[PDB]
Structure 1
Amino acid sequence: QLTIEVLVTVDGVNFRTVVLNNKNTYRSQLGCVFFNGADISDTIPDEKQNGHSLYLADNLTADETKALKELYGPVDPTFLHRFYSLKAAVHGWKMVVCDKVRSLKLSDNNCYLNAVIMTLDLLKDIKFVIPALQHAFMKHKGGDSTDFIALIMAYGNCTFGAPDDASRLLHTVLAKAELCCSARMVWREWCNVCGIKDVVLQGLKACCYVGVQTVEDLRARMTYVCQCGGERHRQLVEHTTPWLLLSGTPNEKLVTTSTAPDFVAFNVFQGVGHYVHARLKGGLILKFDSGTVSKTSDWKCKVTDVLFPGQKYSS
């Protein structure tokens, strides 16, 4: 006969009242529920819990299912449980600020998240297509990174304490992003006999390339056999972007400030699962090894992602 009124949400915006008894578990009476970070599905409602807001993760109403699809986009059924679990596990992590630069301190093999996050921090005019990603992005810019860390890990299928691939995660996250201004990428494919074909990429698709790590290797002419029997070529003919991200496999490269490289920053893989985020500032390389800075003018390192400023190119 004793009951408690609880408020149920999936978004912290819309709430439904559920009347619960104190003779059965939360899982039996309602479903998977989180309260102030912890999963209380296997607990029996306590009189003190009346009026509290609970986060449900399964057995959602039609209205809850729609709100979820609009907030997170299409997600698998375990998404909410993984996101709320991640959010709780990641709470103790520390974002430190070294000379106004936010870096994720080392804990539970999170070093790849440092390279990912610090790289996203340099990407000008990027909005997130998924509202929940945009809210956590904005909270991260304000000084509270928990939501963003957990959502990236949730969308990337990253396990707490497990090492991962920075490039994998960066591109996965960036597939859910949009560009505020406009960008173009024109790849011309041709045979002097068969004809010319132009392929046009717009938005942030024009700002990311995987398989090349220099603007020279990007702009280089590619040649292979044509159907006619002659030569077929592929070459980048137009490129207009607010920034440029080029990614590749760990590749030894002597990085020096003496030649003033056109790139702004780069990530490095060291080997297991170790990542370092480097930036070019004041004629130096600032190496951010998970909330630990080190400055050098020259570095021979296994380069992965390389960030360049805006492109204004015509072949």
Structure 2
Amino acid sequence: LTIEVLVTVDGVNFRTVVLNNKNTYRSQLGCVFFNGADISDTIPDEKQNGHSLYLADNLTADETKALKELYGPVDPTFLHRFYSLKAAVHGWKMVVCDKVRSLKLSDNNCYLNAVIMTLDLLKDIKFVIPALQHAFMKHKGGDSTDFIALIMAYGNCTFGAPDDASRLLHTVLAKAELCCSARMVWREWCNVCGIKDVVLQGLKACCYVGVQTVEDLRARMTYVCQCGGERHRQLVEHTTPWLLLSGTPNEKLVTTSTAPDFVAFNVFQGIETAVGHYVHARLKGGLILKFDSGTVSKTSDWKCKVTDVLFPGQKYSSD
């Protein structure tokens, strides 16, 4: 005959739809997920009678704003991509390597291993979006499927394809906030326009794309001013619990004997004009722990192309 189903986006608000057993879910309603599986192209039967379904296509007006409440300001394709990506990465595994968790290699997800393992070191961050923060807490508890899929959905990552660990890592952190104070003050001046200080606080004072050493971050910068002259900018105060600097792959010789100041970094292997490979590295006990997608190996010395570099807390004041 006909079944009644509960349609939800939030799990606490439901809409009743009655369907026939003559057409598929996709033609009668849209794309639906039942217990994490896609059943849009199946015919409704009594097994789903009286059960809740997670709808992705053709959201109603109220379900759309409930969606913006749960996931933030997302586009209409977002919910379908997240639901599909989540069941696609069902087979993926977090493997314990030397007391920490690393993403086993599967379907070109090595960039995700670099992103997640870097995020796992930032133990002072929180997400403002409720669905993202929930998946983050589930990840830290041992179930990472939700977090992985949401990260890929917010990042516009296509399944099974390589991508950019730096871009995704900083895109994710743009949605986060710091649980302590942090602050960086820039001084900008132009001989015609004058001088002015710019202040950033919170987690935005802890990430920067464009340099890969603290010395380069602290150097003077010069660029065209709105008046046409040359404007300068220089870091003048910096207090943070950590510092994440990212740039293009840059070959360096990482060495324990000199005892470097950074605590972790990411490496791109290969040439940048082609599909390469990511490794996540950490400094512990006078060695470099190299986390390569569920495997770990250790070296005192490593010539490698660095992308992201994680430094400890900053305490700086100049001029």
TM-score range, shorter chain: over 0.9
Aligned to 1:248, the other structure's residue is in SS state strand
Shift of 1:195: 3.2
Is the contact between residue 164 and residue 273 of structure 1 (CA under 8 Å) also seen in structure 2? no
Shift of 1:281: 0.6
RMSD: 1.9
Change in CA separation of 1:238 and 1:43 when aligned onto 2, cut-off 3 Å: same
Q: Distance in 1 between matches of 2:199 and 2:222?
A: 20
- What do residues 8-31 of structure 1 show as CA deviations (whole Å, max 9, x unaligned)? 111223222222221222123222
Q: Distance in 2 between matches of 1:191 and 1:80?
A: 47
Is the contact between residue 251 and residue 304 of structure 1 (CA under 8 Å) also seen in structure 2? yes
- What do residues 138-177 of structure 1 show as CA deviations (whole Å, max 9, x unaligned)? 0000000000011011111111110000001001111111
Q: Distance in 1 between matches of 2:40 and 2:3?
A: 15
| TM-score of the superposed pair, with normalisation by structure 1 | 0.94
Change in CA separation of 1:36 and 1:280 when aligned onto 2, cut-off 3 Å: same
What is the aligned-residue identity percentage? Answer: 100
- What do residues 270-298 of structure 1 show as CA deviations (whole Å, max 9, x unaligned)? 00131000001111100001111011111
Change in CA separation of 1:4 and 1:210 when aligned onto 2, cut-off 3 Å: same
Aligned to 2:242, the other structure's residue is in SS state strand
Change in CA separation of 1:66 and 1:193 when aligned onto 2, cut-off 3 Å: closer
Change in CA separation of 1:239 and 1:30 when aligned onto 2, cut-off 3 Å: same
Higher mean alpha-carbon deviation, 257-266 vs 22-31, is at 22-31
Is the contact between residue 33 and residue 39 of structure 1 (CA under 8 Å) also seen in structure 2? yes
Is the contact between residue 191 and residue 230 of structure 1 (CA under 8 Å) also seen in structure 2? yes
Change in CA separation of 1:152 and 1:229 when aligned onto 2, cut-off 3 Å: closer
Higher mean alpha-carbon deviation, 184-193 vs 55-64, is at 184-193
Q: Distance in 1 between matches of 2:193 and 2:43?
A: 74
Q: Distance in 1 between matches of 2:121 and 2:215?
A: 22
Change in CA separation of 1:8 and 1:297 when aligned onto 2, cut-off 3 Å: same
Is the contact between residue 4 and residue 19 of structure 1 (CA under 8 Å) also seen in structure 2? yes
- What do residues 165-192 of structure 1 show as CA deviations (whole Å, max 9, x unaligned)? 0001001111111111121111112357
- What do residues 230-251 of structure 1 show as CA deviations (whole Å, max 9, x unaligned)? 9753210000111110000000
Q: Distance in 1 between matches of 2:169 and 2:99?
A: 22
Q: Distance in 1 between matches of 2:309 and 2:302?
A: 14
- What do residues 77-123 of structure 1 show as CA deviations (whole Å, max 9, x unaligned)? 11111111100110000100112211000010000000000001011
Is the contact between residue 124 and residue 242 of structure 1 (CA under 8 Å) also seen in structure 2? no
Change in CA separation of 1:173 and 1:224 when aligned onto 2, cut-off 3 Å: closer
Q: Distance in 1 between matches of 2:88 and 2:193?
A: 58
Shift of 1:133: 0.6
Could you tell me which runs of 5 or more consecutive residues in structure 1 were left unpaired when the two chains were aligned.
Answer: none
Instruction: Tell me the equivalent position of 1:58.
Output: 57
Q: Distance in 1 between matches of 2:226 and 2:12?
A: 59
Shift of 1:54: 1.0
Shift of 1:226: 7.7
Change in CA separation of 1:76 and 1:227 when aligned onto 2, cut-off 3 Å: closer
Could you tell me which runs of 5 or more consecutive residues in structure 2 were left unpaired when the two chains were aligned.
Answer: none
Change in CA separation of 1:227 and 1:83 when aligned onto 2, cut-off 3 Å: closer
Shift of 1:224: 6.1
- How many residues align? The count is 314
Shift of 1:126: 0.8
Higher mean alpha-carbon deviation, 180-189 vs 15-24, is at 15-24
Shift of 1:269: 0.2
